[PDB]
Design a protein around this ligand. Structure first.
Ligand SMILES: [Ca+2]
Ligand SMILES: [Ca+2]
Lengths: 213, 213
């Protein structure tokens, strides 16, 4: 028995509400709901995207990578269209635009496709790192060389300059390993984000199952 | 148009089937399905548990940790009951027993509870590692000291022995950092497992939504 939970708008007009953005939790529209068969629920998945915009854009970047790895040529090549500006703005402008459209996407069908492509990219990257690290001598399969360079892209000895030649040979592996440490840190952050986001989506679907009955 | 996909048992009697365990894919029972409101689907989630038993037991261990961190005292303290043997067997025997019961669990309601507790444990561990690493000097919050020791548990200088005293002071941090590297590797593996498992569960729920209509 918790009237403050049944009546959240009335609760927000009290003296003991500590919410950071009162009343946002009852705003209803495409940006805060999902639907299956045009039955709507207020979506934990949409709330996550709003609370965690920074990580959501990291996952959108993975979607773009997934598209290229699935040969979705047109989707990939048009992914930065319709940005309007002829000048620089946010460094992540095309990703920010897609984030807005993802927030606007209500159908479970379309959101299933999004998470499926992101997970495909995450598994591809994990498989490439396992291959990198399975022997101290670095040897990658053909497909994993491609994944290595794709992730790397979509994301001197002043005392005796002649000695830099030897330094470069020694350092080639340090640079590759540094790339993999960076990719590994990005993957852990993307995985913790994905785990939480898809659990929120899973809980939203239970809510839909309850309501569709 | 793919008759071999509509008629998988007939396909398994052909000359071009490469499946590793033909006919397993049409076995129907509690161990291969889930249900909502007693509407059943053949479950990707159950197939994952069967293909990935090793990782499933890692996630079950996280459930047990989650229980202790949520104060579920009775569930925790009884979690190794009913093992029958008075001798040693599989090193993971109580976890193996629980794995069998998880595979036997059909209701979406109960499986939601499982994943929710596991995710709680994963987030707790990630938060503890972020705290460990946020300064080179190691300082953990009170709650994170507890999480550090819980995860660590649930999972000499022969030339001049006197010098070991100094060695131990130097090595205390190396041991703690080694623990965190080990925990970090376990977390990445648990996260990649969880990502795939809960996506399979999410896809199963879409299948249920389609069928419940
Ligand atoms: Ca290799
Ligand atoms: Ca700290």
């Amino acid at each position: 028995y918790e009237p403050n939970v049944d009546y959240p708008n009335a609760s927000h007009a009290g003296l003991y509400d500590r919410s950071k953005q009162p009343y946002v939790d009852t705003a209803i529209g495409p940006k805060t709901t999902i639907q299956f068969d045009h039955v709507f629920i207020k979506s934990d998945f949409k709330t996550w995207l709003a609370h965690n915009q920074d990580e959501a854009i990291l996952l959108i970047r993975l979607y773009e990578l997934g598209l290229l790895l699935q040969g979705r040529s047109d989707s990939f090549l048009e992914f930065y269209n319709n940005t309007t500006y002829i000048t620089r703005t946010d460094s992540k402008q095309p990703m920010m635009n897609k984030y807005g459209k993802l927030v606007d996407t209500t159908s479970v069908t379309c959101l299933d496709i999004f998470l499926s492509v992101v997970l495909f990219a995450l598994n591809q990257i994990d498989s490439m790192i396992c291959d990198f690290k399975n022997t101290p001598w670095i040897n990658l399969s053909k497909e994993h060389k491609k994944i290595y360079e794709l992730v790397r892209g979509i994301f001197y000895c002043p005392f005796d300059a002649n000695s830099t030649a030897s330094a470069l040979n020694v350092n080639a592996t340090l640079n590759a390993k540094k790339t993999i440490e960076l990719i590994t840190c990005g993957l852990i952050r993307a995985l913790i984000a994905y785990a939480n986001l898809v659990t929120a989506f899973s809980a939203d679907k239970t809510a839909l199952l309850h309501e569709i009955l």
